Amino acid sequence: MSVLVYSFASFVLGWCLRSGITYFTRLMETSS
Amino acid sequence: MSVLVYSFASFVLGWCLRSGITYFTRLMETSS
Amino acid sequence: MSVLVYSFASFVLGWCLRSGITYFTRLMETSS
Amino acid sequence: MSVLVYSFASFVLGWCLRSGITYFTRLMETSS
Amino acid sequence: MSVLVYSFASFVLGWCLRSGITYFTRLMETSS
Amino acid sequence: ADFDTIYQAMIQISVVLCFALGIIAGGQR
Amino acid sequence: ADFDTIYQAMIQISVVLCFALGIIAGGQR
Amino acid sequence: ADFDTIYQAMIQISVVLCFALGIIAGGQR
Amino acid sequence: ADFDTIYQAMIQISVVLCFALGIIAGGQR
Amino acid sequence: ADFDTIYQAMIQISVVLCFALGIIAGGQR
Amino acid sequence: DPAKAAFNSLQASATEYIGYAWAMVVVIVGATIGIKLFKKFTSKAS
Amino acid sequence: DPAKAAFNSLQASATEYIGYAWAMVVVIVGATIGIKLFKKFTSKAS
Amino acid sequence: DPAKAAFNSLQASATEYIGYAWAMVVVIVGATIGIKLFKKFTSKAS
Amino acid sequence: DPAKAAFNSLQASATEYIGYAWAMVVVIVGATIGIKLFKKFTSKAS
Amino acid sequence: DPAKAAFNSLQASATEYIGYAWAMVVVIVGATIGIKLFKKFTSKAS
Amino acid sequence: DPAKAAFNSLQASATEYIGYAWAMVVVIVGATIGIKLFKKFTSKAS
Amino acid sequence: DPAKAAFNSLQASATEYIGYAWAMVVVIVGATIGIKLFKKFTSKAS
Amino acid sequence: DPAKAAFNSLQASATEYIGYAWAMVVVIVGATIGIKLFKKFTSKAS
Amino acid sequence: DPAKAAFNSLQASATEYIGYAWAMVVVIVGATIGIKLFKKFTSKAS
Amino acid sequence: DPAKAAFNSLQASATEYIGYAWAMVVVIVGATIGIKLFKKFTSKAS
Amino acid sequence: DPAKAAFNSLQASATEYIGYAWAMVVVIVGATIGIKLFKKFTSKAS
Amino acid sequence: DPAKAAFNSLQASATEYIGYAWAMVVVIVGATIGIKLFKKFTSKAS
Amino acid sequence: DPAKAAFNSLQASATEYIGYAWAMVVVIVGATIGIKLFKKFTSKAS
Amino acid sequence: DPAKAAFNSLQASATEYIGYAWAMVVVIVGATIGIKLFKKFTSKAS
Amino acid sequence: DPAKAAFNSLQASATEYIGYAWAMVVVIVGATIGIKLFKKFTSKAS
Amino acid sequence: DPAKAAFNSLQASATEYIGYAWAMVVVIVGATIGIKLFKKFTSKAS
Amino acid sequence: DPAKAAFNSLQASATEYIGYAWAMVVVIVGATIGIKLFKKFTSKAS
Amino acid sequence: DPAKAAFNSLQASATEYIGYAWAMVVVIVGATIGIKLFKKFTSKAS
Amino acid sequence: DPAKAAFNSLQASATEYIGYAWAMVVVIVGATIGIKLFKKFTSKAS
Amino acid sequence: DPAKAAFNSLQASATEYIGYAWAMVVVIVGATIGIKLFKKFTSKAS
Amino acid sequence: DPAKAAFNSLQASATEYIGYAWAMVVVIVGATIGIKLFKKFTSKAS
Amino acid sequence: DPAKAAFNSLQASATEYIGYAWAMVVVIVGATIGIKLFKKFTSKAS
Amino acid sequence: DPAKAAFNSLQASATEYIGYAWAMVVVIVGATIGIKLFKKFTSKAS
Amino acid sequence: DPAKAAFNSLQASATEYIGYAWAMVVVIVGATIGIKLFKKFTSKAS
Amino acid sequence: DPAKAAFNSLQASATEYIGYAWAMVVVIVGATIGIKLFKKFTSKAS
């Protein structure tokens, strides 16, 4: 289960890092 | 066929979990 | 060439099944 | 380097074939 | 760690090359 | 376990990945 | 290390890739 | 079965995955 | 070279693929 | 053929997949 | 081609969807133009 | 062929997945287009 | 066929909306025209 | 099907979301049409 | 159907607005015609 | 089955990920639709 | 259920906006109608 | 019902304006008629 | 969870972004409505 | 809530604009009615 | 080269797939743009 | 045909208004003409 | 072609509306001209 | 070439729509202009 | 050239309306002038 | 480059598509502007 | 350049429309001024 | 754990990538929203 | 924090645009109102 | 407050125009009344 | 970092693209506002 | 800043347009008032 | 640099369009203003 | 390093692919923005 | 400066129209005043 846990953690890390950009861009765009 | 069945089940699980977010966001957006 | 032919057939099957949903949704949306 | 060269050629072939559809659809859509 | 470092460098290279197209197209589109 | 075991498993993994990529490609409007 | 080791690891990698492709496919509006 | 068998199968799987990723990349408007 | 060599390389390839799929999934607005 | 043969081929397949995923991620507006 | 059957099914399904679309377009456009013309003519007719 | 057997198993699994997707797609599109048609026709009545 | 069910439900929804919309158009148009004609004739007669 | 439970959960969740959407649509459309009609009638009423 | 209930409510809301509007029209028109006739008939008689 | 064990572990991991996504989705959509409703209703008040 | 919380928060936001909007509509409409009626009657009386 | 209160306040303001218009029109008409009658009577007397 | 830290960072970052959005929305909407009302009132004020 | 504060500010900004507008209306209407009555009464008297 | 043989087989398979896609793309775009041109020109006739 | 019924009802209401306008105009014209003839005849007689 | 059939129907619907509109115009214009000539000729003759 | 077939079909569709649209424009424009000119001259002659 | 034919038909209809307006204006002017001259001549004779 | 042939085909295909687009744009824009100008000039020409 | 050719054609189409419009204006204005002067000069002379 | 070491190395690499993305995102969004705000406010000044 | 820098730069851009826009609004509004008031008073005085 | 300064400047310009209108109206009224009185007095004297 | 060179190239390319965008925005907005203001002022200037 | 330079240019372009517009207004208003006073004073004197 | 070539080509295209557009604006505006001024002066002189 | 050699080979292959993409992107965007600018400026000339 | 040339040409055309209007108004005023003076003088003489 070790490689599954760490591979899944890598996927969640990637979503979290990029989602911060997506939310910032979307909020600022609809804000103006 | 075991690895095919369980790998396919993983794909369907992923679609089902995320599709719940997509439908909620889309419906609420067009609702307003 | 067997695994290439069957793997490619799997890709075309997936495109065909989903494209039926995409076309139906798009046509009905622009229809209204 | 052989498998890299042929795998990359496969990627470029796929982009070229599909991009022809994308450009045709986009141009005709904005044309009307 | 060698294959991880070089595989990650390949991903960043791909993002950098394509992002140049995306930014150019988006800026010019909203410019007009 | 055996080479044949790895071969059969790899083939089944390949077709299920190609189907998933097919769904993603087909869902691009 | 052992063939069984590679087999088990490959299976766990496959399910986690299929889930990620599932999220990408499901997030296509 | 044999190492050559795994090698040839892996190469054929690679080109068909790269083509599918190519279609997904090309279909991004 | 050795089974351990293939095992370690495969694991490192898996995490870097899962991160890339994570970026693609997160960039879907 | 040889373990080294499989190792080198797998590495070359990995970098070309990571580049393709990079193009897909970068083309998301 | 092992997936030729899937393409053939999609082709027979697509022609059905196009018929569905044209039917719904005609009814929605008909009502929209009808209401708009009714309001325009009644105002011009004083 | 091992690949043939894998593809045949995938065909059966695919029909389950596309059956699930269709049952969700129908209801969702019935709701979104109905709220779109609702908002449009109310504003047309004006 | 789930596709036919989706089309039929949306066709029924559209028909209902068109009927309700036309009814409201008549009432609102009648009031607007009635007020305008009243103000016009009351000034001509006076 | 190992993921049939996930589909069943999505189905029960979707019907709840559709109810949420219709409720919010009715309140927003109601206020929008109400304000618009109020301004229109007061101007026609001089 | 949430649609039917909302459509009936929007029609009733329009009907009550028309009632309020007509009351205002009568008050304004009555004063307008009254003042005009007052000035006219006063000049004609005296 | 090794695949069964991997899938069962993934199910537990998936509930964590979908719980994280839901907690972010709720707040983000509460903000975007609120700034959309804000801009819309201010302009409607006009 | 995070979905219910999201719907409830958005429903509360919409209700607040509708109330504030209606208040501003009344004030702005009153001024516009007041200016128009003033200019109309002051010319009739003069 | 915010609209009902708003319509009532607008009609109350309208009635106020009429009260003032009628007061002013009586003064203006009285003045002009007075001048006309004065000139007419004096001319007839002489 | 090895990526719980990443989710916690995203959560603290999201609440900051929502504050940024509301601040910019208020200033842009304020100027837009202000300019529009200024033009409307000056024309009504002749 | 940033929304409430902004809505109150937009209402106060509208209120102050209405005050400025009414002042301008009185000045313009006063001159208009004054000039008209001046020309009318001068002709009636002389 | 084993990779060369795989790529050559893929080239033949690709022509089948792009031939399928083209035959669907043509019909679908012929329908969507025709319903777009239809709705546009009807509204232009007005 | 909802439009046909609506147009017929609008024309019927229009004919009603004319009936009332003609009745009022006869009364007003009769009154002013009567005053004119009375003054003219009495002046000629004396 | 569904397009041709719909276009012909929208043209026929416009034609019938023009017929209804012209009938209403004649009724309104007839009363307007009649009342004006009545008041004019009565004053000219008597 | 499937691309040429798609362009040719869409070019034919556009040509048909333009012809039908121009015909309806002439009929609707003729009615609007005819009503306006009739009302203008009937008042000048009367 | 559909526009050329449409413009020519509109101008031809306009010329038709003028022909009718001139006929009616001759009758109305003749009648009023006749009454004026008759009254004037009879008064001068007696 | 094994896929240079594919790029060369895409390049020769793209220049053909650009020609198709410009041809369709000119015809659609021509009809749209023509109809709009026709309506504008006929109204200005009375 | 397809752009230049289309732009020149749209300018020539506007120029010819202006020619048709001016012809219609002269006809309408000529009748309007003629009828007005006819009624005026007839009254002045006789 | 070999997977632990790979994930820890990825964490360090990820911070480099997200630092690069952030430095580009900031500048790009500063430009696009500024040209959006520019076009919007110029047109609002009107 | 790159996010704060992005927000601050966009907030500064918005503030500059609002200031420049308000200045141009005043100049353009002043000209429009000035022309209208000039034409109104010059006709009243003349 | 840019709006406050703009409204004050517009009202100041309005007051300027009134000052000029009153000066001109005094001259025009004086001239016409003078001619009327001169002709009247000379006729009465002779 | 083996791909640091690629990021550095993208950074130097992005600042060039932003300059290109601002240049094209200024020319398009300038022409758009210029044409719009020209039409507005010429109509106000009669 | 390209923004500042463009905003200043658009303001200067508006200023020069206002100058041209005022010149045209004076010419048109001068002729209008001149013709009206000419016809009025000629009738008053002779 | 392919990017510079793209920008230069688009900048040239924009410049051509602006020139052609301004020419057509002048011709169309001239006709509209010419018709309006003609109808205004012909009525003042007549 | 085997990975180093693979990455270096990929760098050379990447420059070919990005060179191909750039040569297509330039022409395509030159066409789409030119038909967008064309449609926009024609409609602005109006 | 295309706008400067266009404004100058519009003002030149406006000055042309005034030249023609003044010529016609002199003829019309001369004719009516001549008839009035002729009738007045002949009546006084006899």
Give the torsion through C-alpha atoms of X41, AG45, AI29, Y31, to 10 deg: 0
Chain AD residue with the nearest C-alpha to that of T39? AD29
C-beta of residue AC32 within 8 angstroms of C-beta of residue AD9? no
Q: What is the DSSP letter of X46?
A: -
* Alpha-carbon gap, residue AA46 to J26, rounded angstroms: 90
* Alpha-carbon gap, residue W6 to U45, rounded angstroms: 13
Instruction: Determine, for residues AB44 and S28 on separate chains, whether the beta-carbon distance falls below 8 Å.
Output: no
Which whole-number Å values give the CA distances from AA40 to N21, O6, AI29, AI40, in the listed order?
69, 61, 12, 18
* Alpha-carbon gap, residue D9 to D5, rounded angstroms: 6
* Alpha-carbon gap, residue V29 to V31, rounded angstroms: 5
* Alpha-carbon gap, residue AB35 to AE26, rounded angstroms: 9
* Alpha-carbon gap, residue Y43 to M38, rounded angstroms: 43
* Alpha-carbon gap, residue Q42 to O32, rounded angstroms: 11
DSSP chain P: -HHHHHHHHHHHHHHHHHHHHHHHHHHHHHHHHHHHHHHHHHHHH-
DSSP E1-32: -HHHHHHHHHHHHHHHHHHHHHHHHHHHHHH-
AF16: which 2 tokens? 């020069």
* Alpha-carbon gap, residue M30 to M34, rounded angstroms: 6
- Using a threshold of 3 CB pairs under 8 A, tell whether chains AB and I touch: yes
G26: which 2 tokens? 């499901």
* Alpha-carbon gap, residue AB26 to M10, rounded angstroms: 44
Look at chain S and count its residues.
Answer: 46
M42: which 2 tokens? 């009351």
Q: Which domain holds residue C28?
A: 1-32
Sole residue written with tokens 């009025």: AF40
The residue type at A32: S
- Quote the Cα angle for AD22-AD27-AD30, to 5°: 115
Of residues Z6, Z21, Z28, nearest to D17 (C-beta): Z6
* Alpha-carbon gap, residue B29 to K2, rounded angstroms: 41
Q: What is the DSSP letter of J27?
A: T
Candidates AG1, D17, W40, M38; CA nearest to AE9 is: AG1
The residue type at C15: W
Which residues in chain I have Cβ-Cβ distances shorter than 8 Å to A18?
Answer: 22-23, 25-27
Which whole-number Å values give the CA distances from D23 to C26, K14, K25, AH39, in the listed order?
18, 22, 27, 19
Candidates K14, C17, U5, G29; CA nearest to F18 is: C17
The residue type at AH32: T
Question: AE35: domain CATH number?
Answer: 1.20.5.80
Of residues H7, H24, H28, nearest to J9 (C-beta): H7
C-beta of residue AC22 within 8 angstroms of C-beta of residue S33? no
AI1: which 2 tokens? 């400066």
Query: What is the radius of gyration, based on Cα positions, of chain W?
Result: 20
- Give chain C's domain count: 1
First to last CA, chain K: 68
DSSP O18-45: HHHHHHHHHHHHHHHHHHHHHHHHHHHH
What are the phi and psi torsion angles at B22 (to 5°)?
A: -55, -50
Interface of D with X in 1-32 (CB under 8 A): 24, 28, 32
Instruction: Determine, for residues U3 and D24 on separate chains, whether the beta-carbon distance falls below 8 Å.
Output: no
CA–CA min distance A32, chain S (Å): 6
- Quote the Cα angle for N7-N10-N14, to 5°: 140
Query: What are the residue ranges of helices labelled H in W1-46?
Result: 2-45
C-beta of residue AB39 within 8 angstroms of C-beta of residue AC19? no
- Quote the Cα angle for W31-W32-W35, to 5°: 80
T24: which 2 tokens? 């301008």
At F25 the three-state DSSP class reads helix
Candidates F4, R42, Z11, R22; CA nearest to AH23 is: Z11
Candidates L14, I25, M14; CA nearest to C20 is: L14
* Alpha-carbon gap, residue F7 to L6, rounded angstroms: 12
Q: Which domain holds residue U18?
A: 1-46
CA–CA min distance U29, chain W (Å): 16
* Alpha-carbon gap, residue D31 to AH38, rounded angstroms: 11
CA–CA min distance AC9, chain AE (Å): 15
Element (H, E) at AH42: helix AH2-45
Which residues in chain F have Cβ-Cβ distances shorter than 8 Å to L3?
Answer: 11, 15
Look at chain AD and count its residues.
Answer: 46
Instruction: Determine, for residues P37 and Q14 on separate chains, whether the beta-carbon distance falls below 8 Å.
Output: yes
DSSP AE2-34: TTHHHHHHHHHHHHHHHHHHHHHHHHHHHHHHH
* Alpha-carbon gap, residue AB37 to AC17, rounded angstroms: 8
Q: What is the DSSP letter of AE43?
A: H
Q: What is the DSSP letter of AF5?
A: H
N23: which 2 tokens? 């409720």
Mutate to test the interface with AA, among Y25, Y28, Y37, Y40 (most CBs of AA within 10 A): Y25
Instruction: Determine, for residues S29 and P23 on separate chains, whether the beta-carbon distance falls below 8 Å.
Output: no
Instruction: Determine, for residues T3 and Q16 on separate chains, whether the beta-carbon distance falls below 8 Å.
Output: yes
**In sequence order, which residues have a C-beta less than 8 Å from that of residue Q26 and are 6 or more positions away?**
R2, R5, R6, R9
Mutate to test the interface with Q, among B17, B19, B28, B30 (most CBs of Q within 10 A): B28
* Alpha-carbon gap, residue P22 to Q2, rounded angstroms: 7
Mutate to test the interface with C, among H12, H14, H23, H24 (most CBs of C within 10 A): H12
C-beta of residue Z19 within 8 angstroms of C-beta of residue D25? no
Candidates L21, Y27, Y22; CA nearest to G28 is: L21
CA AG31 from chain centre, in angstroms, equals 12
DSSP X17-41: HHHHHHHHHHHHHHHHHHHHHHHHH
Which whole-number Å values give the CA distances from J27 to E17, E18, J24, U34, AB22, in the listed order?
10, 6, 5, 30, 16
* Alpha-carbon gap, residue AH19 to A10, rounded angstroms: 32
C-beta of residue AB7 within 8 angstroms of C-beta of residue A10? yes
Provide the b/e sequence for Q11-23 (b: ≥16 CB within 10 Å). eebbebbbebbbb
Candidates W35, B14, L17; CA nearest to V20 is: W35
Interface of AB with S in 1-46 (CB under 8 A): 7, 37, 41, 44-46
Q: Is the dihedral of CA W30, W35, W40, W43 positive or negative?
A: positive
* Alpha-carbon gap, residue C9 to C13, rounded angstroms: 6
Query: What are the residue ranges of helices labelled H in AG1-46?
Result: 2-45
C-beta of residue AA23 within 8 angstroms of C-beta of residue Y12? no
**In sequence order, which residues have a C-beta less than 8 Å from that of residue V21 and are 6 or more positions away?**
M41, M42, M44, M45, W31, W35
Chain AB residue with the nearest C-alpha to that of AF10? AB42
* Alpha-carbon gap, residue AC6 to AC17, rounded angstroms: 17
Query: What is the radius of gyration, based on Cα positions, of chain G?
Result: 13
At T39 the three-state DSSP class reads helix
Side-chain half-sphere of N7: how many Cα atoms within 13 Å?
Answer: 18
C-beta of residue J11 within 8 angstroms of C-beta of residue I9? yes
- Put residue D15 in one of left, alpha, beta given phi > 0 → left and psi -120 to 50 → alpha: alpha
Side-chain half-sphere of D16: how many Cα atoms within 13 Å?
Answer: 25
Three-state secondary structure string covering chain M? CHHHHHHHHHHHHHHHHHHHHHHHHHHHHHHHHHHHHHHHHHHHHC
Instruction: Determine, for residues AD28 and AF37 on separate chains, whether the beta-carbon distance falls below 8 Å.
Output: yes
Q: What is the DSSP letter of W46?
A: -
DSSP S1-46: -TTHHHHHHHHHHHHHHHHHHHHHHHHHHHHHHHHHHHHHHHHHT-
Sole residue written with tokens 């649209």: X21
Subunits next to F (3 or more Cβ pairs <8 Å) are: B, C, G, H, L
At AE1 the three-state DSSP class reads coil
DSSP chain Y: -HHHHHHHHHHHHHHHHHHHHHHHHHHHHHHHHHHHHHHHHHHHH-
Chain M residue with the nearest C-alpha to that of W32? M44
- Give chain AE's domain count: 1
Q: Is the dihedral of CA L17, L20, L23, L27 positive or negative?
A: negative
Interface of C with F in 3-22 (CB under 8 A): 3, 6-8, 10-19, 21-22
Candidates O33, F2, AB19; CA nearest to A17 is: AB19
At X1 the three-state DSSP class reads coil
Element (H, E) at N28: helix N4-44
Subunits next to AB (3 or more Cβ pairs <8 Å) are: A, E, I, S, AC, AE, AF
Chain N residue with the nearest C-alpha to that of O24? N45
C-beta of residue AD29 within 8 angstroms of C-beta of residue T38? yes
Candidates AF24, AA42, AA38, P37; CA nearest to N32 is: P37
X29: which 2 tokens? 């424009």
At S2 the three-state DSSP class reads coil
Q: What is the DSSP letter of S31?
A: H
The CB density around residue V1, as the number of other CB atoms within 10 Å, is 10
The CB density around residue Y27, as the number of other CB atoms within 10 Å, is 9
C-beta of residue C32 within 8 angstroms of C-beta of residue K28? yes
**In sequence order, which residues have a C-beta less than 8 Å from that of residue K42 and are 6 or more positions away?**
M29, M33, V7, V10, W21, W24
Candidates E22, B14, C13, L11; CA nearest to H20 is: C13
Subunits next to H (3 or more Cβ pairs <8 Å) are: C, D, F, J, U
Chain L residue with the nearest C-alpha to that of M10? L30
C-beta of residue H11 within 8 angstroms of C-beta of residue U6? yes
Query: What is the radius of gyration, based on Cα positions, of chain D?
Result: 14
Query: What are the residue ranges of helices labelled H in chain AD?
Result: 2-45
Q: Is the dihedral of CA U34, U39, U45, V3 positive or negative?
A: positive
* Alpha-carbon gap, residue H15 to H11, rounded angstroms: 7
C-beta of residue S11 within 8 angstroms of C-beta of residue P20? no
Of residues Y2, Y13, Y18, nearest to X34 (C-beta): Y13
Instruction: Determine, for residues AF44 and AD36 on separate chains, whether the beta-carbon distance falls below 8 Å.
Output: yes
Look at chain J and count its residues.
Answer: 29
* Alpha-carbon gap, residue H12 to C12, rounded angstroms: 16
C-beta of residue W20 within 8 angstroms of C-beta of residue X34? no
* Alpha-carbon gap, residue I11 to AB29, rounded angstroms: 37
- DSSP E strands in chain D: the ranges are none
**In sequence order, which residues have a C-beta less than 8 Å from that of residue U7 and are 6 or more positions away?**
D6, D9, D10, H15, Z2
Instruction: Determine, for residues I15 and AB3 on separate chains, whether the beta-carbon distance falls below 8 Å.
Output: yes
Instruction: Determine, for residues Q45 and R10 on separate chains, whether the beta-carbon distance falls below 8 Å.
Output: no
Look at chain AA and count its residues.
Answer: 46
Which residues in chain P have Cβ-Cβ distances shorter than 8 Å to A2?
Answer: none
Candidates L35, I22, A25; CA nearest to B26 is: L35
The CB density around residue N36, as the number of other CB atoms within 10 Å, is 15
Chain AB residue with the nearest C-alpha to that of E27? AB32
The residue type at X32: T
C-beta of residue C5 within 8 angstroms of C-beta of residue L3? yes
Chain P residue with the nearest C-alpha to that of S39? P46
Sole residue written with tokens 């959509």: P29
* Alpha-carbon gap, residue J27 to E22, rounded angstroms: 6
The CB density around residue B1, as the number of other CB atoms within 10 Å, is 16
* Alpha-carbon gap, residue T15 to AB17, rounded angstroms: 52
* Alpha-carbon gap, residue E15 to E32, rounded angstroms: 26
Percent composition of chain J: helix, strand, coil (DSSP 3-state, to 5): 85, 0, 15
Candidates L11, G28, H13; CA nearest to C16 is: L11
* Alpha-carbon gap, residue K36 to K43, rounded angstroms: 11
* Alpha-carbon gap, residue L20 to N6, rounded angstroms: 11
Helices D2-31 and J3-26 sit at what angle, rounded to 10 degrees?
Answer: 20
C-beta of residue B16 within 8 angstroms of C-beta of residue G24? no
Candidates K43, I3, AI39, L37; CA nearest to W24 is: K43
Q: Is the dihedral of CA Y5, Y11, Y14, Y20 positive or negative?
A: negative
Q: Is the dihedral of CA C9, C11, C14, C16 positive or negative?
A: negative
Which residues in chain AA have Cβ-Cβ distances shorter than 8 Å to AH38?
Answer: 3, 6
Experimental method: cryo-EM
Instruction: Determine, for residues G25 and F28 on separate chains, whether the beta-carbon distance falls below 8 Å.
Output: no
Sole residue written with tokens 């909306």: M17
DSSP K1-46: -TTHHHHHHHHHHHHHHHHHHHHHHHHHHHHHHHHHHHHHHHHHT-
* Alpha-carbon gap, residue S43 to AC25, rounded angstroms: 13
* Alpha-carbon gap, residue V6 to K42, rounded angstroms: 10
Which residues in chain A have Cβ-Cβ distances shorter than 8 Å to G13?
Answer: 3-4, 7
